mmCIF file of C-alpha atoms in Angstrom:
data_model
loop_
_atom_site.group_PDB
_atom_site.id
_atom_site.type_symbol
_atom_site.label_atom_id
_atom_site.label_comp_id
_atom_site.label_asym_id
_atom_site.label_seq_id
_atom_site.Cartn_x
_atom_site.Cartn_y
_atom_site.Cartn_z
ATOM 1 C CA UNK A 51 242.566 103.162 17.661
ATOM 2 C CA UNK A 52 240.524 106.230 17.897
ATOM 3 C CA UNK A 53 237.993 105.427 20.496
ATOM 4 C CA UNK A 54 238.470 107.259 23.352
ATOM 5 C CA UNK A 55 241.009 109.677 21.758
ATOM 6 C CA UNK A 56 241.274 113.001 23.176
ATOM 7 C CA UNK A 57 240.670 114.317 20.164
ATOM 8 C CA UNK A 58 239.513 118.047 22.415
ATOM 9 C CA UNK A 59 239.641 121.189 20.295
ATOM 10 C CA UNK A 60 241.426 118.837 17.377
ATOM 11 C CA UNK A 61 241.556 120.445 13.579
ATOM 12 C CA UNK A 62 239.183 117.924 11.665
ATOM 13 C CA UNK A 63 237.582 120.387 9.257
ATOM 14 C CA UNK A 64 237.526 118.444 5.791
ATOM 15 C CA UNK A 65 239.088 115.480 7.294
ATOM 16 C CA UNK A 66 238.217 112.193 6.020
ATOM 17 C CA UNK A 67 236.946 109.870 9.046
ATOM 18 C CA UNK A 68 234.635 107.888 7.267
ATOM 19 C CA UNK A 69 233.777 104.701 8.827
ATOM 20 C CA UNK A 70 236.091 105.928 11.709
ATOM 21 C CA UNK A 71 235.766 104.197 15.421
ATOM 22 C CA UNK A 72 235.272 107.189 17.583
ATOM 23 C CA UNK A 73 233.020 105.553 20.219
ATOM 24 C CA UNK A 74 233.685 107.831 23.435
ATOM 25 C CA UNK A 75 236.107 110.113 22.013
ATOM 26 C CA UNK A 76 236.910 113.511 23.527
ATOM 27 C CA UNK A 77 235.786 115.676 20.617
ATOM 28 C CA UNK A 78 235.288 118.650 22.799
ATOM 29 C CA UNK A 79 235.453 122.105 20.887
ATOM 30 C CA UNK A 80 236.778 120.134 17.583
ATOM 31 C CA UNK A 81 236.653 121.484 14.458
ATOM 32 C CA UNK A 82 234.976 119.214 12.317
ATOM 33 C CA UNK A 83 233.564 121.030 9.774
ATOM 34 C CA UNK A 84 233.047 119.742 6.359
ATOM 35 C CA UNK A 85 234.288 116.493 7.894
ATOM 36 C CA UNK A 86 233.403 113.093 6.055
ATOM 37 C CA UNK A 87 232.211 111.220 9.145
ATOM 38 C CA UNK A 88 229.998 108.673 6.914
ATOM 39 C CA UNK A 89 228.970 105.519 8.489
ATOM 40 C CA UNK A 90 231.473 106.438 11.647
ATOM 41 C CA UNK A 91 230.787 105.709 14.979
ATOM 42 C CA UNK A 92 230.162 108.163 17.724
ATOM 43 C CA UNK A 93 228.785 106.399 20.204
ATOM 44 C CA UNK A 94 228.748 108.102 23.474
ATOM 45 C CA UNK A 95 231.339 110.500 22.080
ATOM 46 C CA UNK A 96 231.648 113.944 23.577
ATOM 47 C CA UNK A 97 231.250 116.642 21.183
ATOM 48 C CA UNK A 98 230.283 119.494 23.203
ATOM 49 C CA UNK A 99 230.615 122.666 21.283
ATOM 50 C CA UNK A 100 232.253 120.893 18.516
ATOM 51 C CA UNK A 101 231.875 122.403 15.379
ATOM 52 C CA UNK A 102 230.107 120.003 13.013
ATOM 53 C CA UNK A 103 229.011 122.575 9.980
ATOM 54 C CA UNK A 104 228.458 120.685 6.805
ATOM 55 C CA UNK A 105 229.431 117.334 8.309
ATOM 56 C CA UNK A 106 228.824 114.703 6.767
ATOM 57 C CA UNK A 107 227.074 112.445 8.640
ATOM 58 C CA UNK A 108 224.947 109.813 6.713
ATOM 59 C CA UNK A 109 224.543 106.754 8.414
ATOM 60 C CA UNK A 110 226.503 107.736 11.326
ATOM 61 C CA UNK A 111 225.929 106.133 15.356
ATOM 62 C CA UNK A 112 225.506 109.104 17.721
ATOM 63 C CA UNK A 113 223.384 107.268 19.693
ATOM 64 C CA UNK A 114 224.035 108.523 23.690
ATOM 65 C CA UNK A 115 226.721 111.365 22.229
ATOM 66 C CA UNK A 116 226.563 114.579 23.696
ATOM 67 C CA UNK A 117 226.091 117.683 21.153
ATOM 68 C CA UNK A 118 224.995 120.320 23.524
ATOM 69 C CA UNK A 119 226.133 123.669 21.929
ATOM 70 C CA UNK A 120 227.151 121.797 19.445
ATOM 71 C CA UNK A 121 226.954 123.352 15.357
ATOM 72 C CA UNK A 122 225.604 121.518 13.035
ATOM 73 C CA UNK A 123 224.424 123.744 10.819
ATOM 74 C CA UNK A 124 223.609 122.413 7.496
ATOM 75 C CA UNK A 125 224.931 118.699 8.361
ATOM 76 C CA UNK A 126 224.027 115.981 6.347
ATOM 77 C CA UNK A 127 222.271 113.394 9.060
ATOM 78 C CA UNK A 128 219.769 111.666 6.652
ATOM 79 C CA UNK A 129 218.090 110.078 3.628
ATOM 80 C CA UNK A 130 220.183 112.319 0.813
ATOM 81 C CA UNK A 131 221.421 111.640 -2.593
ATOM 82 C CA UNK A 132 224.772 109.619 -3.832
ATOM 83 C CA UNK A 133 223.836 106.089 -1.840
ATOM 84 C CA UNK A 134 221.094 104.680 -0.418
ATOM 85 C CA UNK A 135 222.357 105.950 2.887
ATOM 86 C CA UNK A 136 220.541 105.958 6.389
ATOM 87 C CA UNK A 137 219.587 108.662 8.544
ATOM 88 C CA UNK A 138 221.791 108.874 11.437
ATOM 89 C CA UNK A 139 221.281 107.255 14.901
ATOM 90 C CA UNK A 140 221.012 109.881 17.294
ATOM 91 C CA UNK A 141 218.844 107.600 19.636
ATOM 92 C CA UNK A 142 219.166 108.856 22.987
ATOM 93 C CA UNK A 143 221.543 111.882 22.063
ATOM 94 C CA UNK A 144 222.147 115.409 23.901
ATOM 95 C CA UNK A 145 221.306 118.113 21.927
ATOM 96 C CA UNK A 146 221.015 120.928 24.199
ATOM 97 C CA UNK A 147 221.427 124.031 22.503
ATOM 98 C CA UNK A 148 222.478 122.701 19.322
ATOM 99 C CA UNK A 149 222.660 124.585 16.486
ATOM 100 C CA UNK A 150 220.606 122.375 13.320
ATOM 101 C CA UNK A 151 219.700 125.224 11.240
ATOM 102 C CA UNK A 152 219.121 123.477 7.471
ATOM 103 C CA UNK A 153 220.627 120.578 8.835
ATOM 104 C CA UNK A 154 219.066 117.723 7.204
ATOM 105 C CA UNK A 155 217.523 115.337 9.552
ATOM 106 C CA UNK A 156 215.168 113.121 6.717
ATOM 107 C CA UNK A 157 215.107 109.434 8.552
ATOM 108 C CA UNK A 158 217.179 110.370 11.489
ATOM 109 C CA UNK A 159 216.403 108.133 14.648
ATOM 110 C CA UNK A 160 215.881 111.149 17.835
ATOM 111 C CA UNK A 161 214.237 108.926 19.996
ATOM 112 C CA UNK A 162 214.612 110.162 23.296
ATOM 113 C CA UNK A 163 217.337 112.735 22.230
ATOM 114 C CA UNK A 164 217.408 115.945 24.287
ATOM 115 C CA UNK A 165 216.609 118.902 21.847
ATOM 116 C CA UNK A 166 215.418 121.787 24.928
ATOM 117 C CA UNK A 167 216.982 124.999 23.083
ATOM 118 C CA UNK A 168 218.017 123.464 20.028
ATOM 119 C CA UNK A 169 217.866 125.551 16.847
ATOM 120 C CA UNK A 170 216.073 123.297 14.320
ATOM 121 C CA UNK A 171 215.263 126.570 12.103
ATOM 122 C CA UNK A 172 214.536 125.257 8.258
ATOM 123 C CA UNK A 173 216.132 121.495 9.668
ATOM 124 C CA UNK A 174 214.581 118.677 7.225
ATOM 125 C CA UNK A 175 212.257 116.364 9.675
ATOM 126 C CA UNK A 176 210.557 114.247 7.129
ATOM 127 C CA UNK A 177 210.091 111.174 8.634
ATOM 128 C CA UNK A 178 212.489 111.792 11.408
ATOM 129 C CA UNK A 179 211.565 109.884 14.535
ATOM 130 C CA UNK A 180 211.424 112.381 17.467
ATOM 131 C CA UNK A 181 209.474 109.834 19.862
ATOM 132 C CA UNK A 182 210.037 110.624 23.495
ATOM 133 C CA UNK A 183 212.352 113.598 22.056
ATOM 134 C CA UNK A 184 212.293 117.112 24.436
ATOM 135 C CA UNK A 185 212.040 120.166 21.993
ATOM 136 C CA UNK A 186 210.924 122.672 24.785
ATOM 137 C CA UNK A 187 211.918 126.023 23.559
ATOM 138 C CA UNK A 188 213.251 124.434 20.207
ATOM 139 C CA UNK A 189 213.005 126.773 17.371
ATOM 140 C CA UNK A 190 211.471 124.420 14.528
ATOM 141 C CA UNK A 191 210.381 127.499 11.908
ATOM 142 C CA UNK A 192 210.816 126.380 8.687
ATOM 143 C CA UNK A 193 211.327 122.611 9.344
ATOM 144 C CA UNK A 194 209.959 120.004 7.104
ATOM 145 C CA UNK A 195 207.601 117.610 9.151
ATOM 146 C CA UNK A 196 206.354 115.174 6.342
ATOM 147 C CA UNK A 197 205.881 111.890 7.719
ATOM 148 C CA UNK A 198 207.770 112.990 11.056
ATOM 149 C CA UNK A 199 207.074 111.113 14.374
ATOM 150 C CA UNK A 200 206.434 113.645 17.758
ATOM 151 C CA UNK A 201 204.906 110.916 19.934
ATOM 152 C CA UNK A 202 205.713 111.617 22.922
ATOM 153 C CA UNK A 203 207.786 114.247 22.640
ATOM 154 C CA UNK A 204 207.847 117.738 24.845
ATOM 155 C CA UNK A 205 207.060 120.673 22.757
ATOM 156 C CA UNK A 206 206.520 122.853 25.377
ATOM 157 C CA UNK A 207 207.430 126.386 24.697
ATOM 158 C CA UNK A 208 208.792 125.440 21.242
ATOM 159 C CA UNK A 209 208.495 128.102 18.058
ATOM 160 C CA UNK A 210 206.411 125.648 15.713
ATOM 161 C CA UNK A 211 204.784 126.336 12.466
ATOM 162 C CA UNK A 212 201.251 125.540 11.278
ATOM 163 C CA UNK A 213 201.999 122.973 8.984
ATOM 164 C CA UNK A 214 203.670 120.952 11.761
ATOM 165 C CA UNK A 215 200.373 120.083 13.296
ATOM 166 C CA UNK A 216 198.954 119.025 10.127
ATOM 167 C CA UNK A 217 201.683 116.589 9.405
ATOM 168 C CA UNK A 218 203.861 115.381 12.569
ATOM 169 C CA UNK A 219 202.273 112.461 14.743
ATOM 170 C CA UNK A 220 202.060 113.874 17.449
ATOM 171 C CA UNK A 221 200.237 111.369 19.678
ATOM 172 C CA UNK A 222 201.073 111.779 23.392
ATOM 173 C CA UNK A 223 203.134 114.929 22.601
ATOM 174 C CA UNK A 224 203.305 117.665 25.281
ATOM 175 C CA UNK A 225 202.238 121.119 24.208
ATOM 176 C CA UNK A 226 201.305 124.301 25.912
ATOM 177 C CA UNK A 227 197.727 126.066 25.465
ATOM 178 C CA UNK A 228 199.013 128.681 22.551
ATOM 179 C CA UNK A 229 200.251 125.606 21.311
ATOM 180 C CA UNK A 230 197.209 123.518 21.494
ATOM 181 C CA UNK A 231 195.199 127.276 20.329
ATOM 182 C CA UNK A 232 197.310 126.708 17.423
ATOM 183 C CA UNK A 233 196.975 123.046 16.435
ATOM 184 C CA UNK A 234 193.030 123.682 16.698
ATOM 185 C CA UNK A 235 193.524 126.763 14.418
ATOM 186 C CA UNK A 236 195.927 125.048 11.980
ATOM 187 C CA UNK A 237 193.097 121.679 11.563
ATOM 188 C CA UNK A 238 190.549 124.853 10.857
ATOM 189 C CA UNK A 239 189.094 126.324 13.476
ATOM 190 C CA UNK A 240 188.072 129.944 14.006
ATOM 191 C CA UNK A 241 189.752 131.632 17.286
ATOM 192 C CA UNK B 51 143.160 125.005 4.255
ATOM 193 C CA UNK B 52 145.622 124.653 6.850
ATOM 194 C CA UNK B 53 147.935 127.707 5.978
ATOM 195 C CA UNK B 54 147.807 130.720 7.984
ATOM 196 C CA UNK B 55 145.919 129.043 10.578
ATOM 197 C CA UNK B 56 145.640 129.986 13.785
ATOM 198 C CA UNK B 57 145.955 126.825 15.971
ATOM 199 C CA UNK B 58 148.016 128.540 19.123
ATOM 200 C CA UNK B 59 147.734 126.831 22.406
ATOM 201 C CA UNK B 60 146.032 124.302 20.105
ATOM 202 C CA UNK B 61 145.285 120.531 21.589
ATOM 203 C CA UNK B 62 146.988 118.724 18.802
ATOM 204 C CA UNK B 63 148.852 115.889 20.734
ATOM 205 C CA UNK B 64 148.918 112.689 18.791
ATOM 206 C CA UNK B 65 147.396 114.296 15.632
ATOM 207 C CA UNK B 66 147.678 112.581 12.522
ATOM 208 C CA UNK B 67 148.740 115.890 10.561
ATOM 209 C CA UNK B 68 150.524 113.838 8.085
ATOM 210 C CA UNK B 69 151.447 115.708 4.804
ATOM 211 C CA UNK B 70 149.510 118.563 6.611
ATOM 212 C CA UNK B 71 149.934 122.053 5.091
ATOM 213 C CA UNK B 72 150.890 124.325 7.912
ATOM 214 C CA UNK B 73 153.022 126.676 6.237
ATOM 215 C CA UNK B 74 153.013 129.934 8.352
ATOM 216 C CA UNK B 75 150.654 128.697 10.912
ATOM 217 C CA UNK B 76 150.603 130.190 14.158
ATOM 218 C CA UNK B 77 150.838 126.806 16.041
ATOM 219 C CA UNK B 78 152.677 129.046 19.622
ATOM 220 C CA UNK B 79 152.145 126.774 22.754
ATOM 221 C CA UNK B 80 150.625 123.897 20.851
ATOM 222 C CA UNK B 81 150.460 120.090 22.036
ATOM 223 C CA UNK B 82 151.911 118.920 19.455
ATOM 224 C CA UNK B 83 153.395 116.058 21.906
ATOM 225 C CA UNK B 84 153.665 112.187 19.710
ATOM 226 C CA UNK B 85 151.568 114.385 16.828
ATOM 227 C CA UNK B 86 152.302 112.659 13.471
ATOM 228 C CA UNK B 87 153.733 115.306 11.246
ATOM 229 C CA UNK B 88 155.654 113.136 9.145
ATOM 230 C CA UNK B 89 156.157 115.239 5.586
ATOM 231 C CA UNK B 90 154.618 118.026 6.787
ATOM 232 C CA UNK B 91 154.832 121.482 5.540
ATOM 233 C CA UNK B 92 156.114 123.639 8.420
ATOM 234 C CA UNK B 93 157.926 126.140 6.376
ATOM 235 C CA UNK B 94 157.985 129.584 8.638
ATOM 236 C CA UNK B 95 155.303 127.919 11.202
ATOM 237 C CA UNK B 96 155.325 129.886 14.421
ATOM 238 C CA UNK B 97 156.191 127.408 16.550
ATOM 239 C CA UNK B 98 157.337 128.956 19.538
ATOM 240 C CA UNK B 99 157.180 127.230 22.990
ATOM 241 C CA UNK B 100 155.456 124.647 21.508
ATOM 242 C CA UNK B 101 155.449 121.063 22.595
ATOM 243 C CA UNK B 102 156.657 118.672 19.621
ATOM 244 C CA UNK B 103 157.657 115.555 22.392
ATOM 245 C CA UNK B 104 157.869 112.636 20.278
ATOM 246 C CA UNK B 105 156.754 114.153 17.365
ATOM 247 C CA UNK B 106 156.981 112.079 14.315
ATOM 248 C CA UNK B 107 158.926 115.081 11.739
ATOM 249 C CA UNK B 108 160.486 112.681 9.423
ATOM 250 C CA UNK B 109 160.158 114.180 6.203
ATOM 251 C CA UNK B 110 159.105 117.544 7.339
ATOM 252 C CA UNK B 111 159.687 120.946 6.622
ATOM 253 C CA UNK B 112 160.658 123.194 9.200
ATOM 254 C CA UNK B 113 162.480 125.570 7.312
ATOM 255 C CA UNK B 114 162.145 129.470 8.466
ATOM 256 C CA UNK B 115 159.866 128.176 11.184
ATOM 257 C CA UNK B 116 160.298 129.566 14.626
ATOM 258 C CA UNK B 117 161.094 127.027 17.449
ATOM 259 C CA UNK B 118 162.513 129.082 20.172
ATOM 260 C CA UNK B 119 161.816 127.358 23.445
ATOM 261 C CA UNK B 120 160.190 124.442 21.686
ATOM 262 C CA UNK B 121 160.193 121.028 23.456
ATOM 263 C CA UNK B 122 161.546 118.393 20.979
ATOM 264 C CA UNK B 123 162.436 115.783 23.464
ATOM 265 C CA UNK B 124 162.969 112.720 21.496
ATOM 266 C CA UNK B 125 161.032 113.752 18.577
ATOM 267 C CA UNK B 126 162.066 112.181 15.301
ATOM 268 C CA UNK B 127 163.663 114.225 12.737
ATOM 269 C CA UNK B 128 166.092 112.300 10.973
ATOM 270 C CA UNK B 129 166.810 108.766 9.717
ATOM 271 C CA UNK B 130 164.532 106.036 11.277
ATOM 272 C CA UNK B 131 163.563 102.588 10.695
ATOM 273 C CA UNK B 132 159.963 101.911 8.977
ATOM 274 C CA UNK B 133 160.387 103.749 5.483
ATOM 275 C CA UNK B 134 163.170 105.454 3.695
ATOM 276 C CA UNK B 135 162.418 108.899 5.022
ATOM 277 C CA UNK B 136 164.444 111.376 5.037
ATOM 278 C CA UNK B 137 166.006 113.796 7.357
ATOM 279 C CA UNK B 138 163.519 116.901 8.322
ATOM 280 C CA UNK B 139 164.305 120.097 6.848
ATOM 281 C CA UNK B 140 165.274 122.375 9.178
ATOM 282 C CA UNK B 141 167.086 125.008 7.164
ATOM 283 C CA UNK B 142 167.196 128.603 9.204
ATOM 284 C CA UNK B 143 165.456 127.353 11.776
ATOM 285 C CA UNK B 144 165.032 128.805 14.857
ATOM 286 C CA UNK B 145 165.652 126.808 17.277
ATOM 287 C CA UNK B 146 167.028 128.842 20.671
ATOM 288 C CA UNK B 147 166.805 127.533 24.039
ATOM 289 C CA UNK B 148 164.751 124.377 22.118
ATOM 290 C CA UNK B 149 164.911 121.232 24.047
ATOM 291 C CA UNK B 150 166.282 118.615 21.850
ATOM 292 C CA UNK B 151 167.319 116.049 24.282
ATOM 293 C CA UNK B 152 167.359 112.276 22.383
ATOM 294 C CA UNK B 153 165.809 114.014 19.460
ATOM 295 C CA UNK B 154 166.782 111.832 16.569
ATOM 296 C CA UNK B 155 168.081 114.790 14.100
ATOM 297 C CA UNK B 156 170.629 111.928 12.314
ATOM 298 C CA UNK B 157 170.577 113.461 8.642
ATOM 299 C CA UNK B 158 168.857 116.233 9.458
ATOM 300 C CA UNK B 159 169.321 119.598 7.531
ATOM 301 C CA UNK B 160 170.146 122.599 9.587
ATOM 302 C CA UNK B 161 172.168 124.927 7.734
ATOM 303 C CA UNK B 162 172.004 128.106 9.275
ATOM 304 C CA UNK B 163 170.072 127.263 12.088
ATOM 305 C CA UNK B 164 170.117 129.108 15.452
ATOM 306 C CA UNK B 165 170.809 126.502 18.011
ATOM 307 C CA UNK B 166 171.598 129.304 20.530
ATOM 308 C CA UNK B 167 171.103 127.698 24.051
ATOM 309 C CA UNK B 168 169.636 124.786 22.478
ATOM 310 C CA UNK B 169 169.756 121.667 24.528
ATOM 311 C CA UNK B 170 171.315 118.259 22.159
ATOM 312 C CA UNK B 171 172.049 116.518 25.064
ATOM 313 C CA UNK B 172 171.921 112.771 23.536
ATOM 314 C CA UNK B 173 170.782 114.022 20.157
ATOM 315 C CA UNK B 174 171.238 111.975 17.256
ATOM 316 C CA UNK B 175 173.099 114.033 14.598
ATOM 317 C CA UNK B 176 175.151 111.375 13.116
ATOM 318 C CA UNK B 177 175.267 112.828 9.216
ATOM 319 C CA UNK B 178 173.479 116.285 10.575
ATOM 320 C CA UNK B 179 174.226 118.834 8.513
ATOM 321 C CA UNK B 180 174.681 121.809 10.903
ATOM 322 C CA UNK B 181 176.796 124.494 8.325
ATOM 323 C CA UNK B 182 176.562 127.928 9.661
ATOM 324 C CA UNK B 183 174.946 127.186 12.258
ATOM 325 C CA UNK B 184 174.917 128.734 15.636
ATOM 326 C CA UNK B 185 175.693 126.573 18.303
ATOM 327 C CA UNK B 186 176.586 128.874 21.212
ATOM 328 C CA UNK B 187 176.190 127.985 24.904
ATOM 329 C CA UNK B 188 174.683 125.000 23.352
ATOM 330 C CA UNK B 189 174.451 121.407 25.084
ATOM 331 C CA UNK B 190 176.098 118.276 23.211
ATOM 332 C CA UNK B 191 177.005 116.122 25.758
ATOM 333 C CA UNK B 192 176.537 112.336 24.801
ATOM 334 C CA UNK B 193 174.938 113.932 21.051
ATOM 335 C CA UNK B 194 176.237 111.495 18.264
ATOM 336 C CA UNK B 195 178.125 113.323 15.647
ATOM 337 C CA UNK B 196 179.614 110.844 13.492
ATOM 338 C CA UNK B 197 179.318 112.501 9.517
ATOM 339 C CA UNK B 198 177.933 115.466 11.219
ATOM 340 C CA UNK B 199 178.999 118.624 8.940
ATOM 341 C CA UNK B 200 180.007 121.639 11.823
ATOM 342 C CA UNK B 201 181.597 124.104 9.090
ATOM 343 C CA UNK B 202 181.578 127.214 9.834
ATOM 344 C CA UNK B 203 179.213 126.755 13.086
ATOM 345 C CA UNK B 204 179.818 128.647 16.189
ATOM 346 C CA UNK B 205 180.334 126.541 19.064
ATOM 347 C CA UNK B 206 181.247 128.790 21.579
ATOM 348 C CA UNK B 207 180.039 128.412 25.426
ATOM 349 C CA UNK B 208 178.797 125.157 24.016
ATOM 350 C CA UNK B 209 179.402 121.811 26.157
ATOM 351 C CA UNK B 210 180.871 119.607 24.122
ATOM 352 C CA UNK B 211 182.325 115.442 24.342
ATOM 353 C CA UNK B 212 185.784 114.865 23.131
ATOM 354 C CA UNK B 213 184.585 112.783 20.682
ATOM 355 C CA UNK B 214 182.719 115.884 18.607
ATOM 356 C CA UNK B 215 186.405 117.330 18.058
ATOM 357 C CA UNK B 216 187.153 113.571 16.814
ATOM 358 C CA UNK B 217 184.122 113.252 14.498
ATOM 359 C CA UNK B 218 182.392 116.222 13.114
ATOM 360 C CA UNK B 219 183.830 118.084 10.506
ATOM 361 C CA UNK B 220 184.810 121.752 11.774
ATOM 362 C CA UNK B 221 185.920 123.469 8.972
ATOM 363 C CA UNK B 222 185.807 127.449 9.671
ATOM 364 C CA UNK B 223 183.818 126.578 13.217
ATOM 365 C CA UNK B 224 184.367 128.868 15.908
ATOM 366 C CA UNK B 225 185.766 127.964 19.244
ATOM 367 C CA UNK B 226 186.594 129.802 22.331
ATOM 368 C CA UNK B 227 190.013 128.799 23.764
ATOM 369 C CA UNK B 228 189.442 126.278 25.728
ATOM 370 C CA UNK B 229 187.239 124.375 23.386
ATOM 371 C CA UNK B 230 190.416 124.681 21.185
ATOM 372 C CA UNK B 231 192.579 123.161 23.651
ATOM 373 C CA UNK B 232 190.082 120.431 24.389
ATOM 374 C CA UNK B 233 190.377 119.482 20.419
ATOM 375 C CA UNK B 234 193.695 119.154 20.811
ATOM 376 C CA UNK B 235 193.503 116.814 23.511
ATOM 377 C CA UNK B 236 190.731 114.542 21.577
ATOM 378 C CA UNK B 237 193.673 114.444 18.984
ATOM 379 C CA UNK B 238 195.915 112.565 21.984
ATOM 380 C CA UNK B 239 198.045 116.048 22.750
ATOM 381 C CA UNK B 240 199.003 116.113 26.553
ATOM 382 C CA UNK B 241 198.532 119.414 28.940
#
């Protein structure tokens, strides 16, 4: 059984837990890099500052998890090629801080994940649902928006692109004045 | 012959100057008030401070004329009932510090018109086409804009509804800031 292992600071990189149980496991610091974590469960888990890089994480549950500082850095967490795999569940996650740069996020399910400070530089967002998400001071340059759902979210203080405003729902979302200068801009207007 | 003439501070006021020739008159403080100038030629017609309530323009040309301080208060400019007439021509107008309130201007041409300190309030410009035109310290409130064509119009200092930044197409217009944040909100953004 590998829910609630202390599995803190482990060496994962590469390792194969696909389909693993790891609902509430201590993955604190781990090295998981490269790891095959398809379809596993991570329910809950604790992977502060764990190093995710290159994960694989199709179809994975990280719904409640915490991630905060966590590097994910060109992780696989949705709609890719090989199967006809899933975005991940990162419903209600903690993603403080987190480090998503080209992670790709197509499908993923945010809602109500905790994003404030997260690096989402050049992430893939196409049709990721970010509903009731907080991205204040994200840094989203570079991500692909196509299809994406904001509703509700915070953006507040958040580095966004142009092309975001044109293409994320972003009905209810929070935003600052530059921000709201900018989404009038982006739809056309003259400032 | 009509053209030319000088008719200022004229007693026109229910006139039926249908199809009249007035191109270039100098019709300056006229009663014009419920006057029918339905398809007439007002092409560079001075205009100014003159008093058009009611007026029957459908069909007219108004283009080049000079309507500063004019009182248009529900004339009718634009698509009606009785006939199939068409919108008035109001191309270059000038039309600062006019009153327009419950004019019906609904497919009315005003490209490159100067609505500087004009007051819309409760103007119909549903299908208006008000391209280049200035619209500065303006007032829209309760002016129907559905189809109305705002590109490249300056709105700034204008009051404006919500629903304009929902409606009109603003292509190029310019906005100060807080018009720009107020089109964000129309689009469901929170501040």
């Amino acid at each position: 059984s590998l829910t609630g292992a202390d599995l803190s600071y482990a060496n994962l990189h590469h390792a194969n837990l696909s389909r693993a149980n790891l609902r509430s496991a201590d993955l604190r610091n781990a090295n998981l890099s490269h790891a095959n974590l398809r379809g596993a469960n991570l329910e809950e888990a604790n992977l502060e500052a764990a190093n995710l890089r290159g994960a694989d994480l199709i179809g994975a549950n990280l719904s409640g998890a915490d991630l905060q500082e966590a590097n994910l850095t060109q992780a696989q967490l949705g709609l890719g090629v090989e199967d006809g795999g899933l975005g991940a569940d990162l419903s209600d996650a903690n993603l403080e801080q987190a480090d998503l740069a080209g992670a790709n996020l197509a499908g993923a399910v945010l809602d109500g994940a905790n994003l404030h400070g997260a690096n989402l530089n050049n992430a893939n967002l196409d049709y990721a649902m970010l509903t009731r998400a907080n991205l204040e001071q994200a840094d989203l340059s570079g991500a692909r928006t196509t299809g994406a759902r904001l509703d509700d979210a915070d953006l507040r203080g958040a580095t966004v692109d142009p092309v975001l405003w044109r293409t994320a729902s972003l009905v209810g979302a929070r935003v600052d004045v530059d921000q709201a200068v900018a989404f009038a801009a982006a739809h056309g207007l003259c400032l």
